[PDB]
Amino acid sequence: MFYTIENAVPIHLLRTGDEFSTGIYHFDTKPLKLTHSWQTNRSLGLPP
Amino acid sequence: GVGVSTGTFNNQTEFQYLGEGLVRITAHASRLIHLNMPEHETYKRIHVLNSESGVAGQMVQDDAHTQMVTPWSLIDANAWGVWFNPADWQLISNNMTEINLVSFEQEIFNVVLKTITESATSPPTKIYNNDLTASLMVALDTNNTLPYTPAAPRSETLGFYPWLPTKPTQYRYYLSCIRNLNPPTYTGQSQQITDSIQTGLHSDIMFYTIENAVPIHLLRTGDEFSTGIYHFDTKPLKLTHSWQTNRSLGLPPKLLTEPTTEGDQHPGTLPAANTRKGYHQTINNSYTEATAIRPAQVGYNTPYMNFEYSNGGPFLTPIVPTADTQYNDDEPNGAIRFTMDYQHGHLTTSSQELERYTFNPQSKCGRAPKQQFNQQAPLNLENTNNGTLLPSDPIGGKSNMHFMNTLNTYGPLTALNNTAPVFPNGQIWDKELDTDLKPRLHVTAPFVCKNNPPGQLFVKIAPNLTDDFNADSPQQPRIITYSNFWWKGTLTFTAKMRSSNMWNPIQQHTTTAENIGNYIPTNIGGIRMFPEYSQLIPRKLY
């Protein structure tokens, strides 16, 4: 697999007075939990 | 509303048949519940360390952990025995190909609270009054804030009998442990086993309170209460068993010699190996059945009797329960041994308490490790004691631990089957483990709620304070009180009828003059509810 920036993507030239901006990408991602579980098999269900 | 009944008793089993062959199995279950006044009005955080836990070998016997003992009692009816009776089961399993959870609703009624006054006038006489005004506390954790604790796996469900009263159990959940058992031992050896436990990592402490997380309804004799009407979102359950194994998948090799004499004795002949044609997931120009291309892996060996150890301690690594092979193995095939109770089957009368009985699902998948084996590099029909691992080879130097004990064959190619419904002690639905990645099924029960599971029903007798104040003191004294209140639940399923496709008749559970005894009372009033196979209808797999 031999890729080339030049060969696969259009390149913008920028002089001091120039600017550039990504569009606005939207993610499609499974939300991330900010909580931790603790229970282990020895802690699941109805205690004897 | 003192002298008026709030609800109604009904323990009928309605089987509505609809178009295209579906059925609205509606199970009504009523039962007279009895509740005693909680003996310790507080929330206790107890540990548990058994002498047995800290001994050479007896590690498997470890019972350590921490309990949050609440003053509340729980009403769990999640267990087949609650809803159906022997006949019901026979019908459903003998004729439905699949069945699924639909709606469920409980209802508590005809509450009655009772005071008990002591009269030690010579012989200890008991006087029973009615505290018309006292109340019965009821709480419904709709959102499941309180830790889920199915009763079924500890036969602490409601009584599988409509004509017999029953008791709800003490609600107590698990709390973080920091169990220590280093290091494992073996029956004989002398070593110093450290056996400790200290309430888990602070960051993992979960201390719930019925009072703090759920609104509680007070109920006086004339009061009533009812769950809404919960709807399940569950993967339908198959009531049929597969049989085909990898040695029974696809196009059987064509024979060249059909027998000429009656009897399963005389078989047919297959052309020699070599001359056979087709795919091979091996090199040798000879195509054998054991070594033949199959769609996938039906079943899989799960390292058996393996004990894993995480914070809370050591524990057995669960195995998907599937039917045993002709070499009744069980333990490696996750068989499930239930223990009955004077209220969940098992002759009410019998002198000995509880019953045994192990269970084996019908779907054939399981294995017979005492048979399995491995060969090296280019296979080679005709082993090399050196290039062949056997079911009797010493692993890691121990003369009885063979490779199978450590062998795990799970893979993308694995095709597996779900647990089976176990009438009656079996659990029915189950909450899903809130982990980022979920399990493909549970062993506990066959139904796992995709959404939020039905709510836990809590009960506790309202403290009947005396005149000897409260507060400004440890444990408060109160009038001895108790309650008799009825309960009615309505569990609704959906199932499909079966149909004659093949030529031969199939399995079906029936009455033999040698078992009716089990479905008939005793000359004294004994009743049994011995468990029965389920999923007894044959099914193609490929």
From Swiss-Prot, chain B:
GO cellular component, one term: host cell
Sites where the protein binds Mg(2+): 143
A GO BP entry: symbiont entry into host cell via permeabilization of host membrane
Compartments where located: Virion; Host nucleus
Molecular function per GO: metal ion binding; structural molecule activity
Major location (coarse): virion
Keywords: Capsid protein, Clathrin-mediated endocytosis of virus by host, Cytoplasmic inwards viral transport, Host nucleus, Host-virus interaction, Magnesium, Metal-binding, Microtubular inwards viral transport, T=1 icosahedral capsid protein, Viral attachment to host cell, Viral penetration into host cytoplasm, Viral penetration into host nucleus, Viral penetration via permeabilization of host membrane, Virion, Virus endocytosis by host, Virus entry into host cell
Residue segments, region Disordered: 250-278
Domain of life: Viruses
Protein family: Belongs to the parvoviridae capsid protein family.
Misc remark: VP3 might be a post-translational cleavage product of VP2 in several autonomous parvoviruses.
The protein's role, per its UniProt record: Capsid protein self-assembles to form an icosahedral capsid with a T=1 symmetry, about 22 nm in diameter, and consisting of 60 copies of two size variants of the capsid proteins, VP1 and VP2, which differ by the presence of an N-terminal extension in the minor protein VP1. The capsid encapsulates the genomic ssDNA. Capsid proteins are responsible for the attachment to host cell receptors. This attachment induces virion internalization predominantly through clathrin-dependent endocytosis.
Free-text domain note: The N-terminus of VP1 is sequestered within the mature capsid. It contains a phospholipase A2-like region and putative nuclear localization signals.
Protein name: Capsid protein VP1
Organism of this sequence: Porcine parvovirus (strain NADL-2) (PPV)
Record lineage: Viruses, Monodnaviria, Shotokuvirae, Cossaviricota, Quintoviricetes
